Design a binder for these strands. Structure first.
Ligand code: MG
Ligand code: MG
Ligand code: MG
Ligand code: MG
Ligand code: MG
Ligand code: MG
Ligand code: MG
Ligand code: MG
Ligand code: MG
Ligand code: MG
Ligand code: MG
Ligand code: MG
Ligand code: MG
Ligand code: MG
Ligand code: MG
Ligand code: MG
Ligand code: MG
Ligand code: MG
Ligand code: MG
Ligand code: MG
Ligand code: MG
Ligand code: MG
Ligand code: MG
Ligand code: MG
Ligand code: MG
Ligand code: MG
Lengths: 51, 159, 222, 185, 58, 172
RNA sequence: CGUGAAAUUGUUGAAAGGGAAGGGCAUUUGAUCAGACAGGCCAGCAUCAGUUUUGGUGGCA
RNA sequence: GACGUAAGUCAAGGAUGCUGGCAUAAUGGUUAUAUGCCGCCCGUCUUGAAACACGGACCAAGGAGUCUAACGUCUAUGCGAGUGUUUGGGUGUAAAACCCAUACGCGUAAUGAAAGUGAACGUAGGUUGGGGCCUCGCAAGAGGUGCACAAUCGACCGAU
RNA sequence: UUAAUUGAACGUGGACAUUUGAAUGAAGAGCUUUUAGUGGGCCAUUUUUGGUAAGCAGAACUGGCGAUGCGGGAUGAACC
RNA sequence: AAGCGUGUUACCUAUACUCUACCGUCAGGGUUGAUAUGAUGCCCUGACGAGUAGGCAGGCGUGGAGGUCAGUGACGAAGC
């Protein structure tokens, strides 16, 4: 009789999408990435600052 | 006053092509037409008998009758707010086979050939054609291909 | 006393099993979204480190929004707007990018704003403004059984199954996209950002391909 | 504003009820409305729609037309169902013993069917003994053999019947209908 | 007084309110216009085709 | 155009079987966002090479920032623009700290002094004058004199009230 | 000379009126008026649901 | 659906709880006036009417698609290869109601100018569809029969 | 019809099914009968004829006004 | 500049867009071994709503007629 909106109303957010509880608890919306420090080749950087 | 004769406004439509005048070559005389053949219409100005009206230039029809020197063609004509069926008796000079039908029959055989090998292996042979998909990811190497281009050029006159 | 308890308990036994299946599909969808995004990010990095450039795959999906009213529309673009189910202003549908559909977008170009929707914009759109076409009626989704009873024959059992079919243009995108009623968006909450909508995005208007800023614009309407 | 593809508020264009005020036909509609809703038998939905039909839309069905439908193999023991009037046919001299369900029987038709050993029943007796319409045979009479249909679609070269009061020579057998007088249609 | 002599204005909006439609092709089109010699013999070919199927099937 | 942004747009023709690995053409574009950037790129490749967006490809879109966004430098810019009755080349000079902000000043200058819209302007080259005395304009040369020092006479103070009780002054 | 309408008019009473009057939405003021105690009238606060608007702040890429 | 081991609870298929005032012109309605903003005179002909186009000073009463003969489509009803009692006759509680013979009209035969002739080779034909029904299948489906209707090729009747 | 089953046309019997032969949409699809009003048009963009031109006269496609109020162009049939 | 050109935001407000309610229309449905006795009823669901000429539908009113309310009325009908 009344469309209760998900993205609010956490109860309806849990009626749909049972993974919303796992996503909330594991903080998957703020997941850390892995620090990898590869650097661009000389050709890319020299092309970037080229006039 | 206004003139609306049969061959009116056909000055360039019924012209022979440049340096393609004279007698008709014998290929059109040896083509065999059958009831159900898809045919295109292009009137030959050199052959005035058996000749279509200016409306039917560039129209594609279906052979319904085969005569001594001529062919009967079904053509749908848009009259008012609906299409009407039109029967034309056209000599074979103004008739060529439609290449649209010839190309579709190749894909009918090729679909059968792909489906004959289907029951050996490989369900869902993807027999339907598809539109052009967006391009996939690729890596462009600059080996021998370093980017370089100038800016817009200034205005000159060249006169 | 009429086997009511047995048919009562066995219905939640079915409910738990379907909930469990959906839960382990949404965990697998979450993983592959994260896996795909990180692999594209490293694709740009490893091509940069090798002196190359990584050319992104061309976008396979747009979200077209009709930004122009219904009066004074030429016939050919008007017929395309009906074939894309954009029958009123601020209505939106998803379109699968092919050369056949790319030519529809060129003819309705002065009348629509479109571009490439992100997962976030597809998720908020389906969760808030998602409606089903159930026997020619417009039914709010609001439940996995509503999607299951209509798209289950294509494997789409829940609302995330449907969203997965939209963002990843799958084998059943057409059936899963026609099932969705055209989205009835609002007017943008901050406005359009331009004084005049009816120029191209490139000229400083609002229509045309605005490839990635459609996400910001649609979220204001949504 | 909505760019409407189809006409809005369009009625279905089909009868949902008989225009007749027959209190007894309304009970037959009431019984078959219940039957077509609480059963999945296609027969009950077809009969319900036929009970709305207008008089020209249910032409009379001859007993000879009934008897010819009983020359189909395996159709002899089926219950002929006619949503309309069954008339009599003197041109046929032998009639089989069969059960016929109809809205109306003429006195000659009811006499001929019963004298053959058969039975005449109404559509509510049919509903009781064939609730799903099992082993039935719906027969419809010829619609376009009506004289009015002869004049439908009148025009040149169409070979239709002109709307005319007096026939014979001097009545539209001249210029327009023979080449000796102007043209032929 | 003078008036407008001709215009095709609105004549396509009128032709499209009721949907310009193809003439509804059938199986077995009418044999009108077919060659008489072919049609005369095709009648005699159809008779014996049915006669052969009469004896074979019965 | 909250600010202009400078992008490199690198593109190429679409590879064919007969000529794979095309030449990888690159330009520098001043645009408000990456959409206008890619649009302007194809507009200029039309002026030079036989290619359009359908027969071409965008391989790289990289924003370029200033190596030193906070040192005041003298910028020399060449602009080809369209007047109401012809096309004209001109060379102007802007004193600022970034290429993007000089372009912002330059587009304001064309539209103010020549009524030339962004539509009509072709940025030929934006070059920082490397050393002094290659600056040829007196409106920039006057800002390179040693120990420069000027006042700001007639200060106008914006009040936050409609009525003031003091008859305010303009000292500074 | 049954009843005794309206146009039009007289008296009384009320009201408004700086180059027309009349009207539509809303409210003030005046005058006038219906209903209801076995809950009718107007509100205040709390916790929610739906739709929005405006901030503060946190974690990530 | 969520939480809770469960019991049960909850923000989970649409507002409940607590408190105060009044109980009448207080709210509300109506009406007069005032104020803000808006509002050109209706009807007609017209591409276009507030028009410097026409009718209209006001009010009451009257005032304009009717009836008939014949007919087309559609619909309802009665009967049905028939149908129509009411021209007449009988009868009557008397312009009503009730009852009826022979005719006649239309229909059941067409075609030709006419003289005339005059409708089954067949399961009243064949082919393609065709709702419904029957058989087998959990169902999907397959086969059989297929009224109306649609297309087409035949057969028969009359003219030539 | 061919010198000749050589053909032509129509067939009997057999094999093939949801990726059954591009995309998108489908608002139910198709069909019929009957009848009203109308048959003075005009305007805008683009093409275009006569004309020096015209708030001129005449055409093409489309959109409008007519037949339509609402917000804007102070004001206005057609503009946004 | 409260002018001209250009850029950025903020803000104002249509009978337009979103949400909800109510009215009507259309469409799809549910509902009989008590339909908690009105099946032209009750109810569920979705969408839709401009309009001259014109068409159809459902209703309001007037004079008279058959039936009914053993209807109202000089203790005041009709009219105003
Ligand atoms: Mg000519
Ligand atoms: Mg000759
Ligand atoms: Mg706001
Ligand atoms: Mg005229
Ligand atoms: Mg008196
Ligand atoms: Mg008076
Ligand atoms: Mg005065
Ligand atoms: Mg709240
Ligand atoms: Mg008051
Ligand atoms: Mg006032
Ligand atoms: Mg005013
Ligand atoms: Mg005039
Ligand atoms: Mg007027
Ligand atoms: Mg006059
Ligand atoms: Mg006068
Ligand atoms: Mg009167
Ligand atoms: Mg006239
Ligand atoms: Mg008019
Ligand atoms: Mg103005
Ligand atoms: Mg205005
Ligand atoms: Mg415009
Ligand atoms: Mg300004
Ligand atoms: Mg209306
Ligand atoms: Mg009207
Ligand atoms: Mg009366
Ligand atoms: Mg009285």
């Amino acid at each position: 009789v009344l469309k209760k909106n998900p993205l609010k109303n956490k109860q309806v957010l849990l009626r749909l999408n049972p993974y919303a509880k796992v996503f909330a608890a594991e903080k998957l919306g703020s997941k850390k990435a892995e620090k990898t420090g590869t650097k661009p080749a000389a050709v890319f950087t020299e092309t970037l600052k080229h006039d | 006053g206004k003139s609306h004769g049969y061959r009116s406004r056909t000055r360039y439509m019924f012209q022979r092509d440049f340096r393609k005048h004279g007698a008709v070559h014998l290929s059109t005389y040896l083509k065999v037409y059958k009831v159900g053949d898809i045919v295109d219409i292009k009137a030959n100005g050199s052959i005035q008998k058996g000749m279509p009206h200016k409306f039917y230039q560039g129209k594609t029809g279906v052979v319904y009758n085969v005569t001594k020197s001529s062919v009967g063609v079904i053509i749908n004509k848009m009259v008012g707010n609906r299409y009407l069926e039109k029967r034309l008796n056209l000599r074979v000079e103004h008739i060529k086979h439609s290449k649209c039908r010839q190309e579709f029959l190749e894909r009918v055989k090729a679909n059968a050939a792909k489906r004959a090998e289907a029951k050996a292996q490989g369900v869902a042979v993807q027999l339907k054609r598809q539109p052009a998909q967006p391009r996939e990811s690729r890596i462009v190497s600059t080996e021998g291909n370093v980017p370089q281009t100038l800016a817009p050029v200034p205005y000159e006159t060249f006169i | 006393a009429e086997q009511v308890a047995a048919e009562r308990a066995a219905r939640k036994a079915a409910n738990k099993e379907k909930r469990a299946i959906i839960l382990e599909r949404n965990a697998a969808y979450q993983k592959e979204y994260e896996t795909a995004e990180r692999n594209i990010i490293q694709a740009k990095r490893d091509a940069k480190a090798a002196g190359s450039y990584y050319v992104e795959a061309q976008h396979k999906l747009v979200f077209v929004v009709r930004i122009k009213g219904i009066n004074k529309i030429p016939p050919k673009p008007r017929k395309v707007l009906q074939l894309l189910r954009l029958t009123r202003i601020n209505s939106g549908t998803f379109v699968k990018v092919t050369k056949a559909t790319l030519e529809l977008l060129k003819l309705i170009e002065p009348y629509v704003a479109y571009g490439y929707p992100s997962y976030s914009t597809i998720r908020q759109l389906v969760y808030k403004r998602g409606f089903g076409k159930i026997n020619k009626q417009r039914v709010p989704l609001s439940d996995n059984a509503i999607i299951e009873a209509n798209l289950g024959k294509y494997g789409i059992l829940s609302i995330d199954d449907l969203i997965h079919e939209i963002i990843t243009v799958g084998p059943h995108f057409k059936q899963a996209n026609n099932f969705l009623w055209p989205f009835k968006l609002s007017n943008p909450s901050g406005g359009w950002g331009v004084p005049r909508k009816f120029k191209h995005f490139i000229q400083g208007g609002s229509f045309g391909n605005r490839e990635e800023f459609i996400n910001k614009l649609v979220k204001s309407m949504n | 504003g909505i760019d409407h593809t189809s006409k809005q508020h369009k009625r279905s264009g089909h009868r949902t009820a008989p225009k007749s005020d027959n209190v007894y036909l309304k009970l037959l509609v009431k019984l078959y409305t219940f039957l077509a809703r609480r059963t999945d038998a296609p027969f009950n939905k077809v009969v319900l729609k036929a009970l709305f039909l207008s008089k020209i839309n249910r032409p009379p069905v001859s007993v000879s037309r009934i008897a010819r439908a009983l020359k189909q193999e395996g159709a002899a023991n089926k219950t002929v169902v006619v949503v309309g009037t069954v008339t009599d046919d003197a041109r046929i001299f032998e009639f089989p013993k069969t059960t016929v369900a109809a809205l109306r029987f003429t006195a000659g038709a009811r006499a001929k069917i019963v004298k053959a050993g058969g039975e005449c029943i109404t559509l509510d007796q049919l509903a009781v003994r064939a609730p799903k319409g099992q082993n039935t045979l719906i027969l419809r009479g010829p619609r376009n053999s009506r004289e009015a249909v002869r004049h439908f679609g009148m025009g040149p070269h169409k070979g239709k019947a002109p709307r005319i009061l007096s026939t014979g020579r001097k009545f539209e057998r001249a210029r327009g209908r023979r080449r000796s007088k102007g043209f032929k249609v | 007084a003078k008036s407008k002599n001709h215009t095709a204005h609105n004549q396509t909006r009128k032709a499209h309110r009721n949907g310009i439609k193809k003439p509804k092709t059938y199986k077995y089109p009418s044999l009108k216009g077919v060659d008489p010699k072919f049609r005369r013999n095709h009648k005699h070919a159809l008779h014996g085709t049915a006669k052969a199927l009469a004896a074979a099937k019965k | 155009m909250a600010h202009f942004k400078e992008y490199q747009v690198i593109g190429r023709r679409l590879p064919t079987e007969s000529v794979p690995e095309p030449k990888l053409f690159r330009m520098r574009i001043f645009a408000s966002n990456e959409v206008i950037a890619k649009s302007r790129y194809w507009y200029f490749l039309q002026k030079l090479h036989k290619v359009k967006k359908a027969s071409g490809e965008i391989v790289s879109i990289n924003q370029i920032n200033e190596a030193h966004p906070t040192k005041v430098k003298n910028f020399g810019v060449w602009v080809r623009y369209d007047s109401r009755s012809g096309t004209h080349n001109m060379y102007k000079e802007i004193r600022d700290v970034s290429r993007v902000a000089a372009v912002e000043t330059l587009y304001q200058d064309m539209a103010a002094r020549h009524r030339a819209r962004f539509r009509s302007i072709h940025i030929l080259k934006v070059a920082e004058i490397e050393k002094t005395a290659d600056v040829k304009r007196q409106y920039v040369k006057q800002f390179l004199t040693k120990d420069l020092k000027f006042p700001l006479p007639h200060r106008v103070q914006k009040s936050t009230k409609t009525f003031s009780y003091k008859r305010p002054s303009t000292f500074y």
